[PDB]
Curated annotation (Swiss-Prot):
The N-terminal domain interacts with the head of the 30S subunit; the C-terminal domain interacts with the body and contacts protein uS4. The interaction surface between uS4 and uS5 is involved in control of translational fidelity. It holds the Pfam family Ribosomal_S5. Residues 1-64 form the S5 DRBM domain. The keyword rRNA-binding applies. It comes from Escherichia coli (strain K12). The lineage of its organism: Bacteria, Pseudomonadati, Pseudomonadota, Gammaproteobacteria, Enterobacterales. Part of the 30S ribosomal subunit. Contacts proteins uS4 and uS8. With proteins uS4 and uS5 encircles the mRNA as it enters the ribosome, which may play a role in mRNA helicase processivity. Can be cross-linked to mRNA. In collided ribosomes contacts ribosome rescue factor SmrB. This is Small ribosomal subunit protein uS5. Belongs to the universal ribosomal protein uS5 family. GO terms for biological process: cytoplasmic translation; maintenance of translational fidelity; response to antibiotic; ribosomal small subunit assembly; translation. InterPro entries: Ribosomal_Su5_D2-typ_SF (IPR020568), Ribosomal_uS5 (IPR000851), Ribosomal_uS5_bac-type (IPR005712), Ribosomal_uS5_C (IPR005324), Ribosomal_uS5_N (IPR013810), Ribosomal_uS5_N_CS (IPR018192), Ribsml_uS5_D2-typ_fold_subgr (IPR014721). Altered uS5 proteins have been identified in a number of mutants. Some mutations in uS5 have been shown to increase translational error frequencies. Gene3D superfamilies: 3.30.160.20, 3.30.230.10.
Length: 154
RNA sequence: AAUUGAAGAGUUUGAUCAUGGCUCAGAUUGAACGCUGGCGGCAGGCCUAACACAUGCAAGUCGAACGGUAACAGGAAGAAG
């Protein structure tokens, strides 16, 4: 599995004494072949937070039906305030996406894609929107299956 | 063969998500200014005062329309070193 650290953030809660700082780590993991998951870890230290995130990511992986390291069709993904658009691209396009979407698409095994993040670009929600977009993407076979047709008829 | 094409980031908070403005990375120019400055090719060069303008030049040509002959170049006559 390829692993990527998207974001580390210092968060704080107040107590009687003062402030207690801690760290959050957002990570994605993927096999580079249409399997991808994200993880979010919290700890008092940065490396502990990353380790927790990576462990979470490995167990929460979903399957994406790719085509030649690009998408099957244009997809929209939404989570919270994040709305993402992703489109299939030709070979040699590369990942034309912002960093959070790029990390997801790279480990998933999407080599060629045109993307755009609308609304909030908060990494935590962009990653959820992106994976939401990918996981509800249909291949021609499942479309043919559900409609009760052959793939050439589709 | 001839529309293969779309990236985000910083900043409100003790921290958060959202909302929302401000700001930045790009491309561009009849540019200007600062520092610096070797050569070439190709292009470009009053965006303001349609303000005022010295001087030179930017519209002539035809004798195969015409009377002519001021030039000067021949030609013919008539005479002087
Ligand atoms: K903003
Ligand atoms: Mg959770
Ligand atoms: Mg916004
Ligand atoms: Mg502060």
């Amino acid at each position: 599995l390829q692993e990527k650290l998207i974001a580390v953030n210092r968060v704080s809660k107040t107590v009687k004494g003062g402030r207690i700082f801690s760290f959050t780590a957002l990570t994605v993991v993927g096999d580079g072949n249409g399997r991808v998951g994200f993880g979010y870890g919290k700890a008092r230290e940065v490396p502990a937070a990353i380790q927790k995130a990576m462990e979470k990511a490995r167990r929460n992986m979903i399957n994406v039906a790719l085509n030649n390291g690009t998408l099957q069709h244009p997809v929209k993904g939404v989570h919270t305030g994040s709305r993402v658009f992703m489109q299939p691209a030709s070979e040699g396009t590369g990942i034309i996406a912002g960093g959070a979407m790029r990390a997801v698409l790279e480990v998933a095994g999407v080599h060629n894609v045109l993307a755009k993040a609308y609304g909030s670009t908060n990494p935590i929600n962009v990653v959820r929107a992106t994976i939401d977009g990918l996981e509800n993407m249909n291949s021609p076979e499942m479309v043919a299956a559900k409609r009760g047709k052959s793939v050439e008829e589709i």
